[PDB]
Structures are given as structure tokens and as C-alpha cells.
């Protein structure tokens, strides 16, 4: 369901794992290309911990297949992104989310 | 300046730049433009990229008149020239567009039949070429925003064209992709029968098909050989190209032929699925022109250029971020600088109540629009719409209200809530607490001290939209609340020591501008008691040097304000006088 | 007329109706603000009861009945066919008077929006129509101002509608006016109003317009202008390298900008074309120019990502190396010595030539021009020549900015008006005939 | 300019006389400016009338007369501690039967022919509470049921007696010195 | 010569703007005199905050907070409009209110607070809207009118509070008559709780509202109740249902304590 392709490379072997918090600093954009959600914009790195439903699937996945320090464009399709009912008032039903993602650190 | 000329302007910014001003003009007693002025003066030039813009209804040459669609016509656009059949009347290409583009599908794919019509993505429109009005004259078709080329001479062949071609490992073609500003055909070439237009018609019909984004041309009922397949997400404005050789050239149709969605459905999202042709008021006719103006930013970046050896060669090196604001219209899919809004009305006064909407949506502790509102004005947007002189006065105070609205609005307004009532706890800094600092009879500086009267938690929620969490729509969202502190106090400090100087510019044109949305986000944050000791100090200092001073210069009291100024200037003392009985009654307690 | 009775027969007042009209507006005139107080206060209870007496003789209903039969003939040219000429001509004032009396009628009084609440919604079922939008608008906006009532009638279909409106007859910012009034009356929040008017107006990104902070991005190029022309002594291929010694993936929020090819000038003027002298444009946004990024082909302002051995963003370390040849137009580029798997092809090649390089902040990159400016690190491919050739011989070769004006004192910034065609940039000896 | 500010708020047209802390506030520091409150000898008699007479006459050179005559009307016969105030004020202002006062008062109300004021009056004083046997039997009965008071004035029998006597006083005053043309407009 | 002071500093700044400029602001005018008035009336500024002061123990100060939040959301909760999710959050503030043992233990800091004023002013939106077809939101005033009854109950001076404002209660003392369940939830039912066991109470009640009263019981004896039939119960002349509950309101009015209030 996503599709990953790497910006800059990583360490590529370490990888995410099971209750370990990824500490991703990430930016988000529609697939036409207006900005949405961005961390870089808050200056605050986003923590997340796997397997556990924090953040949306897409996410999750791209964010597992990438390794620590890996700076990779994410794709995500409605189904594993907000369905087609949507994120009220920001994402409009059944759209492509496409993510800059940088896994910063794992503890 | 003409052709190969160069000249400089001095504003007399500094009098001493000024060459001949003390020979000739001083004693006089003419001023210098920029004497009083605290920033470089903004300077506009003449824009050399044409842009497309709505025909003024007062245009000597060319005019347009819309003919509503009837029961057996669709609606029209008819473009005439008034100018001609007269001396000075301008024979020469003009570029007409409208205004609103068809979007191509995001993802290519790999009686009119009322099912058919509604699933299909196929748009239309037609142009009648008027008799009289030569056909290899007018050119029918599509153009993109990127179409900013204008000459006296237009030709298919000039249309800027480019083919990228994607290759495997091997070398093979798996992709090659022609990009063009321009799509369109002429109408000279694609009658074929001949002279005989001008009996009726020349309709040059124009099918766009969104879904597979292939580009076809009908003219009376043929298929032309001309066909255009662009790229995904391409947004494509309806042309039409034509010298006039007479009063009557050309007009828009916009219905539609058997099995077709007429244009307006692609047009417009409301009437997506509607078949009926339709031609709103946004839709309009818009022409290619060089009367509009360009301004030149304030500052540029430093970019560093040398030579570094035979060895290494030239170095370019640029280290200093310099950052702008662009207001990207949609429609028209171009970003202009939000500073062109100062001399753009129409737009500064739409934004300024567009902002206010965002302020009346996010009004009253709604957090979860306050929440979504985040997205859409981030806070570098806020920080730089806070910190930046140039803005216009408008948007300045409208972009001021909105980020009290998202962040400090509701923490304050409960900490107002809790003002009037104190409830003491009874510790051991709570009997600390005196009246007098130290023994002579000297009040302390108000607000600064020790209190312990129980009040409203700070907290806030991090906006987050990856986060699929309620929990975050509760509490208002967080803002750097320390860069906000000192910039509010450097930003005060310098308005204060400006306006003793009583520039002819203020910060947003007016004192007003300057001073209202400054001293409003500086009460806020003093509600909500962000500011603490030293900063405090430093704001009493700004407010009243003289009887603020811990134990010549006129502060923020003394300087001849303004009226609404002036009122915030009273909340802030009932504020302060609210601290001082606040420590009054905590010494009561005390005592107690 | 409806029953279609002859026009001459039925006696239709068209000059009273609109004289009386006149009278009625002015007569419901809200008092001036320079006027005194105490006058002005006289004025305002003049007005109130006013309106109140004819609320009470229901004036409202017959004023609503007089705009629903002129509003059952669609257009001017409409009513004027079914009754006559001057009855078409007048038509338009007609409505206009009587939608601004009924606003006059209403505006400021409490009482009548309060029972203007209940027929609210037939009036919104025209808003659509051209003829009255701005006058229901009006009346909409005092309505909902005055009376929490009407502001409890107003449902998401009518939102939806306004938003409609919005959509349709482009920015009108008495919208944004009507739509914060929904949202915010005396005082006091309607969150299902602010919601739903978040919900639709502000995910779809379509009317409201779109702020967001740019990088500055700034163009570097060579004095070269390289230009191929029928029976002209210019070299067809071409070749120069930049090195990134330095670059900050993130000086600011946004992504640093770099990127790196050909430009060509509009026409043989040296003024580069297609693109705007300051902002966040840089290669490759405009069909003159074209760019690599280290993942993608940039050229009107659209990427396609390339193939490449290790790709990736452009970084410090990088050998860059971008080939020109305008026997037939094509432009590839070759990253660290290795191809990559994609070219510029068949583009314009009317106008002159020259290297250029777009950045943001946060870099630290140097052109390898050949010859004595530059040396190459990579061997350039057979048939082509370093760009430190295409130097005319009486000019020195700097790296100069692109665009006219740079950063400096503001009194010392030369102003320069158009500049000259670059003639002599191209050779071309023409016979003389003999 | 702040009694410009009240006499316009009284003039702006409303169902309530809606009750203003700073009017209360700022009435009663005038009106206790004005009065400012052994056998005295006629000089020093002479000395104390005429610094009661300045003390007037800076207010109702500014307008208080206005104000207490516009406040009056607005009140709509309705009692309150802003009519208190408001009659304080004009007892301050009348005290000692001030002619000029009263040919101010007498010449606003005839030109700008107020029913409103004389209605105000005619309800407030309609309104005005009178001894009540009844209360009175139900405070002695708690008294001997011996419950502890929750107000020690009892004042629940002669409501507002000072109200009262501030209102006959702002008649007989403005009745005073046989001010025989406001007697009959009266 | 310099003022050293906030109290002076005021004073002279206001005074100098006032005779400096004529000020068109009415806002602006009303403002600067209110705090001239402040700085000249120290007094008055500790007369009206010794009221509102309270004393809390340290023990108390974790609890003291949450009721003080929920007070808060309450009071922020009247400028919004009445809808669904509304009544959810007015319903949980109150429940969280009276689960807290600050209510019950200091029930003078809850008057000082005042939140009787701020439930019964979300009571008199929720009944003012849509009164003559029925309370909208019946929830939210059956959940108001018992916090106020357990207000009352708390102590004898809650009983004081609530009964000043007796005359809007018995004004709408038909509020949830007829519907079961809803006994010890309307504002007859705080009436009575706030003349409940009181001499002092009973002895200060007047004879209009007691008219009021009767008035009501005559209506219910006279006429059926619409809203009974409408459910379709047969259709006898008058109205037990809602005589009963006026009988009792009365009952408390005139026996008190054991023994009959003779006047």
C-alpha cells in the first residue's frame, strides 16, 4: 500500500523494532503538492512507538522499512491513510499523502 | 530608462549621500523624500513578464460581452473590437484566456447516454469564428500558466517545447514526455473546404479528456489530425489566439456535443455533475497585457563570488536564509508576494476578511478548529507575519488576532476569568509573603514578586496530523511561548524608540497599525503571565522609565498616542493595579 | 400578465412603482454620524418606529410577494417580452429597490429579523441568481446579525449553499462577512456553525487564497552565451562540472534549494527569459531552463525523478558534470562520474545558451569551468569542449548573478533599463552578392 | 467631558436604566463635593453659603442639572440605587433653593417638553415602601423564636426610607424660594 | 516632584490625556475614569476583593484545582451556544463538581465562587429557548435543578443564595411537571429545597408568589394536561399529575420544622 524511495541514505542496518519509539521529524504534503502538517514547522521532532496505533498505517510501514538516519519520500494511498471519509477541515476525502520522512533516532 | 541606460535614485535616506542638496535646495527649504523615514523606501518597476488580467471594461480597443445561454444556445463569450473601422485601431496578436483551468486527472489511467455522460471525465468547449475574421489569423486550443510569452508575431512553430526521456540501465526509452506551455491548433489550416467559413460557423471544437489527459480538436464534425497527450496534474486554461481583421472576431461557446461534459462541469466542483452548460460569474475572459507593476524586495541575498585559484576555480557561497511569503491564488495558479498586497486592493482587502473568518471559525475556545486552522497558518507564517515592517497594516493586525485566537486566546481569557477571585493557599511562601519588600516604605515593582494565589494550569496540546489521537483536539494548540516573549520585548522596544523620532512610515503605515496589534499580543502575554522578573522589568522600563526605575527619555505613556492606543494602554494599568490588590490581599493572608 | 393577458389592457404602474421605491428607501434612511448626538438619537427612534409600524401592518410580506412575481421572469429580455419594453428596462432597478427596502425595513430592528427568521429560507433559494445576490446577501447579513433566532434556522444546506455562492461568483468578501457573522453572533459561539463551515470551506484549498514562506532562491551564471545558428562559427557541444564542497540539507524550515544546468535566453537578448527576477523560482520552473537536483529532471516547473547509481539530493562532495549538445538538442547530465539514465531533448534552441545554477541559503559550491577557470575532474566525453572556450577574446569570464539587481545600498543600485541585443554573440558571415 | 459622557448615556434609548458602577460612583463624589459636610456669625454664615455656591456651580456650569433631570426620565419609574445616586446628586446640586439651578432645570424640561420625567417621578413615588405590619409581625416572631438575624437593620419594614426622603427633599428644593413658575409646572 | 508611584503616575496621566484632547471614544472616556476612580479609591479595591479572598489548606490544594478547572470550563461553557455536545460537558462539569469533596467541605468558597448564579444562568438559556414548546436539552435542566437542590442541602446559608432568586423558579415552575423521573429535578423542587426546613425562610415568604402558586394549582384543577392526552391518556378534566407537585411546594411552604408556619 506504500511505496517508499530513499531522499538520502541511511546506516541500512538498523531497522525498527518492537516497542522501540521512532523519533522521526517529518513533512507532509498533499499530492498536488500543498503543504499540510510539518514538524520542521514546529521544531519539535515527532515521537512515535510501533505496533501500538499511534499514527496512521502508511506512516507506520514507511517508517518501519526505513533504517536510522535515512532520509525517505513516503507515499501513502487513501486506504491506509485516512480512508475516504478524511481528516476534517485539513485532508479532503480519499487523497494521496506524500511524506518527507527523517528517522532521526530509535530509543 | 531607455534602451542601454543606467541611473540611480537617493531618496536622501542620508542627507550627506545627498550631492547638491546643501547647494541647492536646503536653504529653499525643501525636505529630502526619505528624511524622516526609518526603512529604505519600497521601489516599484515595470513588470517585464506579461500576465493574463481581466479585460477592463474601458479598454479602447478590445471589448467582451457575455450572451447568456437560452434554451436552444449555450451560454457565450463574445469578444469585439471597438477600436476598429477607425484610425489608431491596434491590428496585432492578442492572447485571450479564461480564467479558470480544467485539471487533468492526478493518476492517468493505464440522445447523450445520461450513464455514460456522468461516469466520463471528458470536457468541451467551442469557438465560432465570426465571418470576415481570417482563420490562419486566430489559433484555438490550450495554454498552461507557464504561458508568459508575448510577440508581435505568433507561430505554431515558436510554441517552447520540451521532451524528457527517461532511460533504464541499458538505454532504452521506457518514457519520453513532450512538455509544451502551449496546445493549441489554427483554425487557417484546419478549414479545409475553403473560403467558404464566412456562411457559417468555423465552430473549432476543443475536447479535453481528463482522465487520460488526450487532447483532440473537432472542426464541423471531423476529427483533426492535431492531438496532444500532457502530463498528470496538468491544469489547462481554455485560449483562443487571433489577430482581428474585423469588428466581430471570435466567441467561446460553452456547450457540449453527444456524450461530452461540458465545460463548466470541469470548471466548477459544485456543478461536477451537472449537464447542463453553465457559465458563471467567476468565468470571464481574460487578456494577455505588459500594464502591470513589479516590486523590487528590500533585501536580497548575500551571495559571495570569487575567483579561488588556476586549482580550484570560482566559488559561489551563500550562508544568510532569506525567507518571503507567497499568496498563491488558485485559480489562476500563480504565487505573488503577500507585500504586493499593498498596492494589490481587491486581494489585501479579501485576505483581510479571510483572516478574520479563520479568527470568527477559531473564536471561543474552539480548539479543534483552532487545531485545523494550524495547517493552514503555520506558525513561521504567524512568527514572520508578526516580525516583518513592510506588510500592510491590514493583514499585519489580521494575522496578529489570528495567532492570539489559535494559542494565547483561550488561556487568557480564563486567567481574566480567574482575576477577580483569590484563593490563598496556606503555606510556608504563602506567610513569607509581605507587604513591603524590605523595610523603608517602598513599593515593590507591581507584578514582580512572590505569589502563590491558585491559578489556571498552563497546558497545551502539540499539533499533529500523522497522530490519529483525540486527545489532542482537547487544549489549545502550542506555540513557542519564549521566542514570542522576546520578540514581543524587542520588537516593543524598537516601536517605542521610533515613535519619539515620529517617522513618516510606521510599522503597517499607520500609528495605529504599528502600535494596536503590538500592545494587544504584549497584553495578552502579560495575562497570561509568560513575562517574568527581569522581562517584566524591562517592560516596566518601556511603559514608564522614570517610575518603573529600580533604585531625558519619555516612555510609552508620554508620547502622544492615539486613541485606541490609549485604551490599551488602560487595560494594561487596570492589569497592573489588579497585581497590586492581588499582593495585597496575599500580605493579608499572611498577616493573617 | 402570468394569465397573459394583452399589455395594453392590464395597467402595469412600472414609473410610480419605482418612484414610490425611491421614496421608501430614502425614507428608511439610518440617520448620519457626523449629525449630533441627541438629533441623532431623535432619527434612530424615529426609524425604529417606523419599522415598527409597518412590520405590524406587514408590509414585509407584501414587499416578499412583489419580489417573488417579478422573480418568476428569469432575465430583463424575459419580462420584457412578456409585458414590454420599458417594463424590461426597469425590471433590474425594480428588484434592487425592493431588495434594499426590505433591507432598510429590517436592518437594526429585532422584532422583524425575529419573524424574518421564519421565511429566511425561501430567500436563500435565489441566492444563485445573478440579479439578486447582492441584495439577498445584504438582507441575509442584517438578519443574521440581528437575530439569534434566524442564526438557530440557518442549517448546513444553507452553508453549503453560501459556500456555493462563494464558489460560484468568485471573492466577495460580503461572503466572508455573512459566513463570520453564522459563526460568531452577540457574543456568543455556534460550534456547529464553526465546524461545518470549517469542514467545507477550508479542506478543499479551491477559493480561500494560500499562504506559505519561500526560500529565496538566486541564479549564478558565466558570462558564456552560447548560441547555434544556420552558417554560424559556434561549437555545437559543450561541457562544465560544479562540486559541491558545502551544503545544509536544512537551514530553514523548507528544504534547501540546488539545482544545477542549462538556461536559455528569450530571443538574443542576454536578459534571461521565462522567469520572475526574485523569488523562490530557480532551474528548471520555466520551459528556458533546465535543472538536476540529483533525483529529478527539472523543466517547467515539473520533476520527474532519474534513474542513477547511490541516488540521491544533492550533497557535499558531489562532482556534477552537465553536457550540452545542440547538434540535436539534448542536455544530460553525469553524477560523480556516472551516467545518468535521462536527457533534455528537442527543446528550443532559438535563443543563446548559457550554464546557471539555482540555490537557497546554506550552500557552498564551485563551477569547474575548463581550461584555466576550472579543471576537470572528470574527462568530458569525446566531441565535446569545456565552456571556458565560448569566451569572447576581448572579454574577461566572470561569474556573474543572472538577474539585474543584486544587494547593495540603495542609492548606489544602478538602475538599468533594456538592454541591447547580443548581435555579436552569434557569427554569422552573410555573402555579399556579386 | 464626563458629564457630557453620562447625559449621553441617559439620552441613548433603552428599556432599562441599566445600572452603571462608575455613574453611582462618580455622582456620589460630586455630590459629596458639593455639600462637603458654636453659634456660626452672620460673616461666616455669608462665607459658607457662597462656598456652597461655587461648589454648585462647578458642577451645573458643566451640565449636572441635565444629567439628573435626563437620568430622572430615563430611570421610567423604576427605583434603584442609580435614581438614589442620581437624587443625592440633584439634592447636592439644589441645596440652599439655587436659583440659577432651578431656572436650568425648569427651561430643559419645558423645551424639551419631558412626560417622561414627570412620569418617572409619579412611578417612583407610587413605588415608594410604607411602614408594614405585616413584616413587622414576622420579624418579632422570629425574634421570639429566637434565630439569629441574618440582617441587623431589620430594614425590611420602611424599605427605603432615605430613598424617600431623598425624593420629597428633591421636590421641596426644587419647589424652594416660592419658585412659584415650577410650582404651577409642577 | 516625580510621582515614584503607579497610584500617582495614573492619576496624572489620565488627568493630563483628559485635558489635553477632547476624546470622541465613549469606551475610551468610561475607561480612563474607571481607573482614575480605582487609583483614588484604594480602599474600595480591598472592600470588594476581601469577599471573593478564600483560605485552603495545603492538603487541599490538588482538589481545590481540579473544581476550579471544572468551574471553569462551566463558566467558559455559557458564552458557547446550547447543542449536544454542550449538554455532555455541562452534564460531566457538574458531575465532577459534586463528586469533589471541596464542595461539601467548603461551601462559603463555592458561594464566593458562585456557581448557583452561573447553573441557574445556563438553566434560564436552556429554558428561555424554545420555553413555550417544551425545554429543550431536558437533561440539562434536570441535572441542573439537582446540583442546586444539593447546593441547598449543603447549608443553611446556600438556602439563603438560592432563595433570592425564588421568584424566577416558581416564575417557571412548570417546567418538567408532568413527565415521571424528573421528581427532584425542576425548579419547583429547588423552590421547595430553598424553603425546605427553614423558619427564617418560610417566615420570608411573600403572599404573590404564594398567588402564583395557587394560580398554578387552579389550572392544573381546571384544566387536563395537553401533553397527557397527547400520549393518550383518557381525557378527564383535571390534572393530578401536576397538582400533586404544587401541593407539595405549598406543603413545605407552610409546615416547617414540625410545627404549621400560622401566617
Known sequence: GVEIETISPGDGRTFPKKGQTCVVHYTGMLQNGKKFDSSRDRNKPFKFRIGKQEVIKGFEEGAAQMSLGQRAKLTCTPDVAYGATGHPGVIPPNATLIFDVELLNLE | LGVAQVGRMNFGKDVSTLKYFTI????????????????????????????????????????????????????????????????????????????????????????????????????????????????????????????????????????????????????????????????????????????????????????????????????????????????????????????????????????????????????????????????????????????????????????????????????????????????????????????????????????????????????????????????????????????????????????????????????????????????????????????????????????????????????????????????????????????????????????????????????????????????????????????????????????????????????????????????????????????????????????? | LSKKAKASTVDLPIESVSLSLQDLIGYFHPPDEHLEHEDKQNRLRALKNRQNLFQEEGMINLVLECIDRLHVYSSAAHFADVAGREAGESWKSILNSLYELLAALIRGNRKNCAQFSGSLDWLISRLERLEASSGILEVLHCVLVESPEALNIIKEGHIKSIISLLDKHGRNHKVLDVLCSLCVCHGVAVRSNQHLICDNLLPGRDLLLQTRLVNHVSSMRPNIFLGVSEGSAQYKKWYYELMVDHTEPFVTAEATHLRVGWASTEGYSPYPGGGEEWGGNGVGDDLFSYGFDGLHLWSGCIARTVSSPNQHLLRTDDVISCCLDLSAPSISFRINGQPVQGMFENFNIDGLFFPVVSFSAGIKVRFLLGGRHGEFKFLPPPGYAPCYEAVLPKEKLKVEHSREYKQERTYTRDLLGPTVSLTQAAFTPIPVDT | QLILLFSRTALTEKCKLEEDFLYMAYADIMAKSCHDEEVKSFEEKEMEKQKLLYQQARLHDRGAAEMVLQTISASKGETGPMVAATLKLGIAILNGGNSTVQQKMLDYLKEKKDVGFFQSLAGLMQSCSVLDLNAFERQNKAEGLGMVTEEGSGEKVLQDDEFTCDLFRFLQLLCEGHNSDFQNYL | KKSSTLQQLISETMVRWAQESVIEDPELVRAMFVLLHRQYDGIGGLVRALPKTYTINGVSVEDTINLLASLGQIRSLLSVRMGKEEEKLMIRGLGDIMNNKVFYQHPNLMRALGMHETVMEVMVNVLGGGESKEITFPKMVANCCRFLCYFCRISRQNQKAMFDHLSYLLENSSVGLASPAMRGSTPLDVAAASVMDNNELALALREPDLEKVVRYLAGCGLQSCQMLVSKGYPDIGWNPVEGERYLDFLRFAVFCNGESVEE
Not at chain 2, 503555520?378 to 492570539?404: C, H, S, V
Not at chain 2, 507584578?447 to 483536539?473: D, K
Not at chain 2, 512610515?505 to 494587544?520: A, N, S
Request: one cysteine or more.
Open chain 2, 24 to 592: 541647492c535646495g536646503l536653504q529653499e527649504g525643501y525636505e529630502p523624500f526619505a528624511v524622516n523615514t526609518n526603512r529604505d523606501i519600497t521601489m516599484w518597476l515595470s513588470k517585464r513578464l506579461p500576465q493574463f488580467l481581466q479585460v477592463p471594461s474601458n479598454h479602447e480597443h478590445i471589448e467582451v460581452t457575455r450572451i447568456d445561454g437560452t434554451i436552444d444556445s449555450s451560454p457565450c463569450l463574445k469578444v469585439t473590437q471597438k477600436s476598429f473601422g477607425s484610425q489608431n485601431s491596434n491590428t496585432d496578436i492578442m492572447f485571450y484566456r479564461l480564467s479558470m483551468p480544467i485539471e487533468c486527472a492526478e493518476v492517468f489511467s493505464k440522445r447523450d447516454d445520461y450513464d455514460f455522460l456522468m461516469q466520463t471525465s471528458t470536457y468541451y468547449y467551442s469557438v465560432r469564428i465570426f465571418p470576415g475574421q481570417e482563420p490562419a489569423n486566430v489559433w484555438v486550443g490550450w495554454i498552461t500558466s507557464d504561458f508568459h510569452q508575448y510577440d508581435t508575431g505568433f507561430d505554431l512553430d515558436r510554441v517552447r517545447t520540451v521532451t524528457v526521456t527517461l532511460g533504464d540501465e541499458k538505454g532504452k526509452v521506457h518514457e519520453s514526455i513532450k512538455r509544451s506551455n502551449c496546445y493549441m491548433v489554427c483554425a487557417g489550416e484546419s478549414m479545409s473546404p475553403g473560403q467558404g467559413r464566412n456562411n457559417n460557423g468555423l465552430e473549432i471544437g476543443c475536447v479535453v479528456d481528463a482522465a487520460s489527459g488526450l487532447l483532440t480538436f473537432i472542426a464541423n464534425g471531423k476529427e483533426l489530425s492535431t492531438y496532444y497527450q500532457v502530463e498528470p496534474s496538468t491544469k489547462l486554461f481554455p485560449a483562443v489566439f487571433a489577430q482581428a481583421t474585423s469588428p466581430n472576431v471570435f466567441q467561446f461557446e460553452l456547450g457540449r456535443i453527444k456524450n461530452v461534459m461540458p465545460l463548466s462541469a470541469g470548471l466548477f466542483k459544485s456543478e461536477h455533475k451537472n449537464p447542463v452548460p453553465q457559465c458563471p460569474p467567476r468565468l470571464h475572459v481574460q487578456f494577455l497585457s505588459h500594464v502591470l507593476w513589479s516590486r523590487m524586495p528590500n533585501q536580497f541575498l548575500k551571495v559571495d563570488v570569487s575567483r579561488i585559484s588556476e586549482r580550484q576555480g570560482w566559488l559561489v557561497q551563500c550562508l544568510d536564509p532569506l525567507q518571503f511569503m507567497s499568496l498563491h491564488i488558485p485559480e489562476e495558479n500563480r504565487s505573488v508576494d503577500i507585500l504586493e498586497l499593498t498596492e494589490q486592493e481587491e486581494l489585501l482587502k479579501f485576505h483581510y476578511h479571510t483572516l478574520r473568518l479563520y479568527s470568527a471559525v477559531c473564536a471561543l475556545g474552539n480548539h479543534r478548529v483552532a487545531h485545523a486552522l494550524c495547517s493552514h497558518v503555520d506558525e513561521p507564517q504567524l512568527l514572520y507575519a508578526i516580525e516583518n515592517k513592510y506588510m500592510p497594516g491590514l493583514l499585519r493586525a489580521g494575522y496578529y488576532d489570528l495567532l492570539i485566537d489559535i494559542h494565547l486566546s483561550s488561556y487568557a481569557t480564563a486567567r481574566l476569568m480567574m482575576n477577580n477571585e483569590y484563593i490563598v493557599p496556606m503555606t510556608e511562601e504563602t506567610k513569607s509573603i509581605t507587604l513591603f519588600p524590605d523595610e523603608n516604605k517602598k513599593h515593590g515593582l507591581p507584578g514582580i514578586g512572590l505569589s502563590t494565589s491558585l491559578r489556571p494550569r498552563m497546558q497545551f496540546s502539540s499539533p499533529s496530523f500523522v497522530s490519529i489521537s483525540n486527545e489532542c483536539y482537547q487544549y489549545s494548540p502550542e506555540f513557542p511561548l519564549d521566542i514570542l516573549k522576546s520578540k514581543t520585548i524587542q520588537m516593543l522596544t524598537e516601536a517605542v524608540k521610533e515613535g519619539s523620532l515620529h517617522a513618516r512610515d510606521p510599522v503597517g503605515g499607520t500609528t495605529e497599525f504599528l502600535f494596536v496589534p503590538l500592545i494587544k499580543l504584549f497584553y495578552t502575554l502579560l495575562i497570561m503571565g509568560i513575562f517574568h522578573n527581569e522581562d517584566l522589568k524591562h517592560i516596566l522600563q518601556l511603559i514608564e522609565p522614570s517610575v518603573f526605575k529600580e533604585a531625558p527619555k519619555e516612555g510609552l505613556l508620554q508620547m502622544k498616542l492615539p486613541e485606541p492606543v490609549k485604551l490599551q494602554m488602560c487595560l494594561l494599568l487596570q492589569y497592573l493595579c489588579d497585581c497590586q490588590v492581588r499582593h495585597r490581599i496575599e500580605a493579608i493572608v499572611a498577616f493573617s
